[PDB]
Amino acid sequence: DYVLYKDATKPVEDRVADLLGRMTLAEKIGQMTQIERLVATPDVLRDNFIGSLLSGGGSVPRKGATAKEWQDMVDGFQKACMSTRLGIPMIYGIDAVHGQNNVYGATIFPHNVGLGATRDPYLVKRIGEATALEVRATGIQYAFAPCIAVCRDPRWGRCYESYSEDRRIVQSMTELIPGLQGDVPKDFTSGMPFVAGKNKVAACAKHFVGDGGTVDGINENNTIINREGLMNIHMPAYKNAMDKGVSTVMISYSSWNGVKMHANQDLVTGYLKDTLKFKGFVISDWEGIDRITTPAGSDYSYSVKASILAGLDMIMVPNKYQQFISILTGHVNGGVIPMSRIDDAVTRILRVKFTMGLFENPYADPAMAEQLGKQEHRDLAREAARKSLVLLKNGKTSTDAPLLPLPKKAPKILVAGSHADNLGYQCGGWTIEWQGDTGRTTVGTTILEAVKAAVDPSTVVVFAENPDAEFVKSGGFSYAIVAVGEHPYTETKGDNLNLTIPEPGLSTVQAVCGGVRCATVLISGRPVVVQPLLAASDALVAAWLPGSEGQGVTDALFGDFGFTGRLPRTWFKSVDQLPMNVGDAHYDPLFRLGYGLTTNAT
Ligand SMILES: *[C@@H]1O[C@H](CO)[C@@H](O[C@@H]2O[C@H](CO)[C@@H](O[C@@H]3O[C@H](CO[C@H]4O[C@H](CO)[C@@H](O)[C@H](O)[C@@H]4O[C@@H]4O[C@H](CO)[C@@H](O)[C@H](O)[C@H]4NC(C)=O)[C@@H](O)[C@H](O)[C@@H]3O)[C@H](O)[C@H]2NC(C)=O)[C@H](O[C@@H]2O[C@@H](C)[C@@H](O)[C@@H](O)[C@@H]2O)[C@H]1NC(C)=O
Ligand SMILES: *[C@@H]1O[C@H](CO)[C@@H](O)[C@H](O)[C@H]1NC(C)=O
């Protein structure tokens, strides 16, 4: 007879109830299971009824894979899932957090701390739109973004995934979500999941909650703050996410006052689901339930009980699915987890799959392949990079001639420093590899290439990565651009207690700037100890991690556009002040939240 869940004209809630009432226990637990593509096979997916797959950082079908290799990979997994008895399509997730950043040739946008400096929610909406197209070009339907952490200490290794220490800036940057997912209807109820169709992706607000609040910015550690602090600093951007229809929420590894978020029923069920009325699904982080215990994974059976009873809907296992499925079936068969907690989880996963069009369009669209790296996207990324630059200094004294903007026509100019010609340093973490990498890892324009592309044909451009002082003073340069800063890092590898840049950084600047007037371009994921760089430089520009389109840097240096960017964070004087945030008692910054100098276009 007639199968209502297969009928595309029926309300979402009727299709969900009709399918759910057919599923066995194996089929329901399979929907809650997300696994990494490395352990997936057609039989695994079909015999375990798997609901979701992901790529972790750097988990790609081949190095250099075109958009169509990605599509064929995702479709081949999808053909296995559509061949199960109920034919429930999988959803494939990926970290597309500054563009579709795992994929060769994708447009790489500025990381989020630089987007905070723009103060333009409309630009960030546009980046979400272009991001969704490049994720759908590879066949993927779900992005793990945005991170709406409110980083409160720049020593954290994920502070550059945070838009700001100020939760008001983070709130206004939740406009990424309707870029990624599409604008919600006039009809719309806060906390419903929404995706507009096959040119959009499901999004993910992460990581709930207080991930940027941890002690000493230690990654994954303990956020010590009282309920009012939680609610007035770390929480509010979640409620803006509910109003824009964010489809999924990801739970943090971090604790709140000693309680693991992955075992917190009060916050996850009591607040997120029952007070904000979130109706999408809640997904764990990568081996988040394992880390509930110390050592991690020492009582997996407890990890499964505590996290499913806290309210988590989908578990990113993501390798050992056999142990997860066995233990979870055991607890349900023993009465330890009731059936109604399972049916709630599966209801939520199915709600998002039906709402986004997945049952009607389970397969990739080959015509979307040419969205990847599209030029109009690279122009948008160029505009973002340019608006994220903060001019901190433009002249060594208040009576000096302003160095920027620089003339395009000069007899001879020097480009120096370890970041002047290194695409991987300019993009930072979460770019091609999980940790990012060095060198020419993808398509884009370095600073040196941007300089060659901008100057008059008669200007001679010399490059030296680390020139000595005598080379600079005898070379006859009119000016130098020197680019230095942090190396790429992600997560705990970026936790950093000293906040000073690797050498050579300071000594290249000192050599270059001692011989010729210099503009210093600092690439970093956060504020770093800056005083010595400031003292040597005529001009100093915080460029953050501007991504693949380095002509956004030279657009402002050479005066096609003015500088407009403003600090999205406090710049400290020393690491012994930290944490120090707008509002604190000991507030004594080198540069306040909100500072930046401007220029006008020539
Ligand atoms: C302030 O705190 C941080 C603590 O995190 C500290 O930096 C960390 O230092 C660790 C060692 O003590 C280091 O681990 C070692 O890494 C070695 C290889 O490191 C290279 O590759 C990694 C991975 O890609 C990069 O992140 C590194 O930055 C490094 O990169 C090379 O760096 C040199 C120097 O500039 C450059 O010329 C190369 O071209 C460049 N190559 C690449 C690929 O980029 C391992 O082999 C070893 O076994 C250790 O595990 C961490 O990498 C590093 N963290 C980061 C994110 O940088 C920092 O330490 C200072 O800086 C580092 C780079 C090193 O030169 C130290 O001697 C120095 O003290 C610390 N600062 C102070 C003042 O204490
Ligand atoms: C925080 O870090 C320390 C190691 O520095 C660890 O012993 C402690 O258990 C961590 N706390 C949490 C909640 O992870």
Domain ranges of the chain: 1-373, 374-559
Ligand 1 contact, 492 CB (< 6 A): no
Give the containing element (helix H, strand E) for 337: none
Q: What is the DSSP string of 38-85?
A: GG--HHHHHHTT--EEEE-TT--SSTT--HHHHHHHHHHHHHHHHTSS
Q: Give the Å distances, CA to CA, from 284 to 191, 257, 328.
A: 19, 20, 15
- Determine the Cα–Cα distance for residues 251 and 562; give it in Å rounded to an integer: 40
* 307 C-beta closer than 6 A to ligand 2: no
How far apart are alpha carbons 23 and 168 in whole angstroms?
A: 44
Going by CA atoms, what residue is nearest to atom 8 of ligand 2? 221
Instruction: Give the architecture-level CATH label for domain 374-559.
Output: 3-Layer(aba) Sandwich (3.40)
Instruction: Round to whole Å and give the CA distance between 203 and 178.
Output: 9
Annotation says 285 is catalytic: yes
Atom of ligand 1 nearest to the CA of 493: 56
Query: Rounded to whole angstroms, what are the CA distances from 52 to 42, 43, 283, 339, 582?
Result: 13, 14, 11, 21, 41
Residue whose CA lies nearest to ligand 2 atom number 7: 221
Q: Which CATH architecture has domain 1-373?
A: Alpha-Beta Barrel (3.20)
What's the CA-to-centroid distance between 285 and ligand 2, angstroms? Answer: 18
Please, are residues 547 and 99 in contact by the beta-carbon 8 Å criterion? yes
Give the separation between CA 160 and CA 494, rounded to whole angstroms: 10
Instruction: List, in sequence order, the alpha helices (H) in 254-333.
Output: 265, 300-310, 321-333
Which atom in ligand 2 lies closest to the alpha carbon of residue 222?
Answer: 13
Q: Is 216 a catalytic residue?
A: no
Q: How far is CA 59 from CA 30, 94, 104, 360, in A?
A: 22, 9, 12, 28
Residue nearest to atom 1 of ligand 2 (CA): 221
Measured in angstroms, how far is the CA atom of residue 524 from the centroid of ligand 1? 14
Q: Which two three-digit tokens encode residue 246?
A: 């964010």
Q: Which of 313, 383, 491, 538 is catalytic?
A: 491
Nearest to 138, CA basis, from 221, 82, 235, 69: 69
How far is CA 412 from its chain centroid? 39
Ligand with smallest separation from the Cα of 466: 1
Closest among 386, 589, 568, 418 to 501, alpha carbons compared? 418
Q: How far apart are CA 76 and CA 54, in angstroms?
A: 14
Atom 58 (ligand 1): residue with closest C-alpha? 502
Ligand showing the shortest atom-to-Cα distance for residue 528 = 1
Task: Select which of 69, 95, 285, 495 is catalytic.
Answer: 285
Ligand nearest to the CA of 156: 1
User: Which of 221, 254, 294 is the best mutation target for the ligand 2 pocket, counting ligand atoms within 8 Å of the beta carbon and taking the most?
Assistant: 221
DSSP 147: B
Are residues 45 and 90 in contact, defined by beta-carbon separation less than 8 angstroms? Answer: yes
Helix segments in 389-468, DSSP class H:
423-427, 447-454
Q: What separation in angstroms does the CA of 72 have from each of 65, 69, 76?
A: 11, 5, 6
Q: Which residues contact 334 (CB under 8 A, 6 or more apart)?
A: none
* Residue 556 contacts residue 600 (beta carbons within 8 Å): no
Alpha-carbon separation of residue 305 from 135, 292, 332 (angstroms): 34, 11, 10
Helix pair 12-20, 339-355: axis angle to 10 deg: 140
Half-sphere exposure of 285 (CA within 13 A, CB side): 22
* Contact residues for 325 (Cβ-Cβ < 8 A; gap 6+): 26, 29, 30, 33, 48
Give the relative orientation of helices 375-388 and 121-137 as an angle to the nearest 10 degrees: 150
Structure tokens at 601: 């276009």
**CA-based torsion, 155, 159, 160, 163: positive or negative:** negative
Compute the distance between CA of residue 258 and CA of residue 580 in angstroms, rounded to an integer. Answer: 23
Total Cβ atoms within 10 A of residue 217 = 24
Query: Where are the extended beta strands (E) located within 61-194?
Result: 91-94, 142-143
Contacts of residue 597, defined as CB under 8 A and 6 or more positions apart, other chains included, come to 391, 392, 393, 394, 563
Ligand 1 contact, 434 CB (< 6 A): no
User: From the CA of 543, how far away is ligand 1's center (Å)?
Assistant: 21
Q: Does the Cβ of 247 fall within 6 Å of ligand 2?
A: no
DSSP string over 499-516: --PPSSSHHHHHHHHHHS
